[PDB]
């Protein structure tokens, strides 16, 4: 545990620690997000038993993989469930989802026989950021911005005692006076419980703050919402204007967007987890396409027949070959 406390840490530890996190934690997390498969209700039901996932050591060595221009990767096997309710019988098989590329201890992957590294990206952390804004004539309007894991841009600016714009986009310029109820919230029940209410007198794209965003939104706004909850709350939106008004009176200070506390570093662990999520997103379409063909032909397929290695292997090869961060090792 005390790796860098005494000695110089291993230069590849960040690459090393990220990959182990992805294997230990980044797999079941994405696999748990894989939903059930069924059209409406028929003699079909497909699902993956996440707890039974396994990884197999690659057959080819690292030297063989580069010499043969192959991809040094591990095979992912998950037990899948199929039932034909007309027969009402359960068919079970250990299916092969695809191949997960493996990096060596030096921190490099090889995909199609070329050494590729995944460099680290620095992004704005999810949370609330109070920053002033000037216009064509100069307004000095304090602006509060909400950032999500999807790079949300829910800006919330104060035009003094006038309306509080909540433009999601540049053309979505909209107030919050009538957006009190908005999504599912209510009328002036809690709006008047803090400061003064005289001023008052989308589903999934940018709506959740994530694990990081919940910590930051509570850190600045001092909210009692537990970190376990991920979805944004109207209390958070209510508290956004609460601290926004204080900046007008001089209390508090504007956030510095260049501060590293406002930045988040995503390593190979984050990127490999995202590509796994995309693969499963493409995998659920494949089985949905397969069951449609299977029903149209009326054959009894094994759970392996409903899946293919293409969704998992292709996305990683596309990721390593096209993503700007995945660079060829120098």
């Amino acid at each position: 545990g005390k790796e860098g406390t005494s000695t110089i840490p291993g230069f590849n530890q960040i690459q090393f620690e990220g990959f182990y996190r992805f294997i230990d934690q980044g797999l079941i997390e994405e696999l748990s997000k894989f939903p059930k498969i069924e059209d409406i209700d028929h003699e079909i039901e497909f699902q993956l038993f996440v707890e039974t996932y396994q990884l197999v050591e690659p057959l080819i060595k690292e030297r063989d993989a580069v010499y043969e221009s192959l991809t040094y990767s591990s095979e992912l096997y998950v037990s899948a469930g199929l039932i034909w309710k007309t027969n009402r019988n359960m068919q079970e098989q250990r299916i092969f989802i695809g191949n997960i590329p493996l990096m060596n201890s030096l921190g490099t992957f090889i995909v199609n026989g070329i050494y590729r590294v995944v460099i680290n990206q620095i992004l704005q952390s999810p949370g609330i950021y109070y920053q002033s804004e000037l216009d064509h004539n100069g307004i000095s309007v304090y602006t509060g911005t909400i950032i999500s894991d999807w790079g949300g841009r829910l800006e919330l600016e104060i035009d003094k005692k006038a309306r509080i714009w909540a433009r999601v986009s540049r053309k979505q310029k909209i107030s919050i006076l009538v957006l009190s109820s908005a999504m599912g919230s209510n009328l002036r029940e809690i709006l008047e419980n803090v400061c003064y209410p005289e001023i008052f007198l989308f589903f999934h794209q940018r709506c959740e703050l994530g694990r990081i965003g919940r910590r930051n939104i509570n850190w600045r706004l001092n909210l009692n919402i537990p970190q376990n909850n991920i979805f944004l709350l109207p209390r958070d939106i209510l508290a956004a204007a609460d601290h926004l008004i204080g900046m007008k009176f001089g209390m508090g200070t504007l956030d510095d967007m260049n501060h590293l506390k406002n930045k988040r570093i995503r390593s190979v662990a984050d990127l490999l987890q995202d590509q796994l999520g995309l693969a499963l997103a493409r995998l659920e379409n494949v089985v949905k396409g397969t069951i449609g063909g299977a029903i149209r032909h009326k054959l009894i397929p094994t759970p392996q027949n409903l899946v293919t290695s293409t969704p998992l292997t292709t996305t990683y090869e596309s990721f390593f070959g096209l993503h700007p961060l995945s660079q060829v090792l120098d």
């Binding site: 599912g184 919230s185 209510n186 029940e189 589903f203 909850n229 709350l233 109207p234 209390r235």
Partner: peptide
């Protein structure tokens, strides 16, 4: 309370 409710849609 609807203040902490996340059941928008």
């Amino acid at each position: 309370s609807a203040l902490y409710q996340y059941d928008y849609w």
